[PDB]
């Protein structure tokens, strides 16, 4: 799922996020579907956090006989969540919440070899939704939400061995047979591994809305169709490139050189839209079943091109992602007043068209398996605890002169606190 994450609740995690938009057993879900609010008698609160601990790795060798082995580049994270749904009147009621739909954090060492294309890339995301719902007849329920999306990103690449490859390349030719090519090559074979090759950094707020639909057969069965729009973040950050201002103009496909001087960069982060369709079926007094099919247009994520005050290009990477689907199915078992339990499986096809593959966004079809429990205290309180094992598919990624190979697994763990009036 590119750099998109759906950890909005701990009860959600427990069921590998299925039926979401059709399950309102906690305020956690109104975030997915605005229409879910029309399902709450009383004011409900809930806030928790998801503990993400990935295990991605890179392996490989550089033409410079160097090691491209990038061990565990994915850092543990904490994605917390806060929700609040509350009735206004029998046909109307609003809600609010703080969630994070997107995120990314891959980091190698400044002395990595494939460091040209792998060094440090982070993305902090925080969606603030304020949705309102309107019931209609005994089955339909429309919902709408507004979103302010704060982001903090900081890209940073360094020169790995390219200077050495760059050098050899020159000398390996006629150029090398000249005090200049010999000089032009000496300059190149000098570049230490940790020479900041590019630094983009800036934070901004983005805006988007999201509508919802709810149609039910009765208090036990329903289906949903939701829509979360695209979000075009226009940053205004800082650009720094320690490469002398001489490497400039030869058109070497190298990120503009400032000379270590911080210039004023511009970037546009495109957060893909999401459509989703899920259903919920309680077939017994204890059993229930939910499933969903999501489609995210990663088509909208084409590149990341930086640009100066006067409009000239500094940094630029082609993503050319494409759309993709997520699929999920799970069950909820209502034991007694107290105990509740969940399980689930899911599968999402990566949007990265194998070829545009990149070691900074080591993505690979992911597989979810989750289990969780809930324990209500008295019809007004209840704590959530969820866990999920995620695994991917080893891919081959040819970038720059280099060729890598990344495999990755991740284990999840959330716990939310519920309260009502
Ligand atoms: C001046 C803005 C500087 C921030 C640059 C934006 C970085 C967004 C990171 C998310 C995309 C991840 N990727 C493809 C670059 O690895």
Curated annotation (Swiss-Prot):
Pfam families registered for this protein in UniProt: Toluene_X (PF03349)
GO biological process: long-chain fatty acid transport
Primary location group: membrane
Protein's membrane topology: Multi-pass membrane protein
InterPro entries: OMPP1/FadL/TodX (IPR005017)
Keyword rRNA-binding set for record: no
Protein function: Involved in translocation of long-chain fatty acids across the outer membrane. It is a receptor for the bacteriophage T2. FadL may form a specific channel.
NCBIfam families: PRK10716.1
Annotated protein name in UniProt: Long-chain fatty acid transport protein
């Amino acid at each position: 799922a590119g750099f998109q994450l759906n950890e909005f609740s701990s009860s959600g995690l427990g069921r590998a996020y299925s039926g979401e938009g059709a399950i309102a057993d906690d305020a956690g879900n109104v975030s997915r579907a605005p229409a879910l609010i029309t399902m709450f008698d009383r004011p409900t609160f809930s806030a928790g956090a998801v503990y993400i601990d990935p295990d991605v790795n890179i392996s490989g060798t550089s033409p410079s006989g160097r090691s491209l082995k990038a061990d565990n580049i994915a850092p543990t994270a904490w994605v917390p969540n806060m929700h609040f749904v509350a009735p206004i009147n029998d046909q109307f009621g609003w809600g609010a919440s703080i969630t994070s739909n997107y995120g990314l954090a891959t980091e190698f060492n400044d002395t990595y070899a494939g460091g040209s294309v792998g060094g440090t890339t982070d993305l902090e995301t925080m969606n603030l939704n304020l949705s309102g719902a309107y019931r209609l007849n005994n089955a339909w329920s429309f919902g709408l939400g507004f979103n302010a999306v704060y982001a903090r990103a900081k890209i940073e690449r360094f020169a790995g061995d390219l200077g050495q490859l760059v050098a050899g390349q020159i000398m390996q030719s006629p150029a090398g047979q000249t005090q200049q090519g010999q000089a032009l090559a000496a300059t190149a074979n000098g570049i230490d591994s940790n020479t900041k090759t590019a630094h983009l950094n800036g934070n901004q707020w983005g805006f988007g809305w999201n509508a919802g639909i709810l149609y039910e057969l009765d208090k036990n069965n329903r289906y949903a169709l939701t829509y979360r729009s695209e979000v075009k973040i226009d940053f205004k950050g800082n650009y720094s490139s320690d490469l002398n201002r001489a490497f400039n103009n030869y058109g070497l496909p190298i990120p503009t050189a400032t000379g270590g001087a911080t210039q004023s960069g511009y970037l546009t982060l495109n957060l893909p839209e999401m459509w989703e369709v899920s259903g919920y079926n309680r077939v017994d007094p204890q059993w229930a079943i939910h499933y969903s099919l999501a489609y995210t247009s990663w088509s909208q994520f084409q590149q990341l091109k930086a640009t100066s005050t006067s409009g000239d290009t500094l940094f630029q990477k082609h993503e050319g992602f494409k759309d993709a689907y997520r699929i999920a199915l799970g069950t909820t078992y209502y034991y007694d007043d107290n105990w509740t339990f969940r399980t689930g499986i899911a599968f999402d096809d990566s949007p990265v068209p194998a070829q545009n593959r990149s070691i900074s966004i080591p993505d690979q079809d992911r597989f979810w398996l989750s289990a969780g429990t809930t324990y209500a205290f008295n019809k007004d309180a209840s704590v959530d605890v969820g866990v999920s094992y995620m695994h991917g598919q080893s891919v081959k990624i040819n970038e720059g002169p280099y060729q890598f190979e990344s495999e990755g697994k991740a284990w999840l763990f959330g716990t939310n606190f519920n309260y009502a009036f």
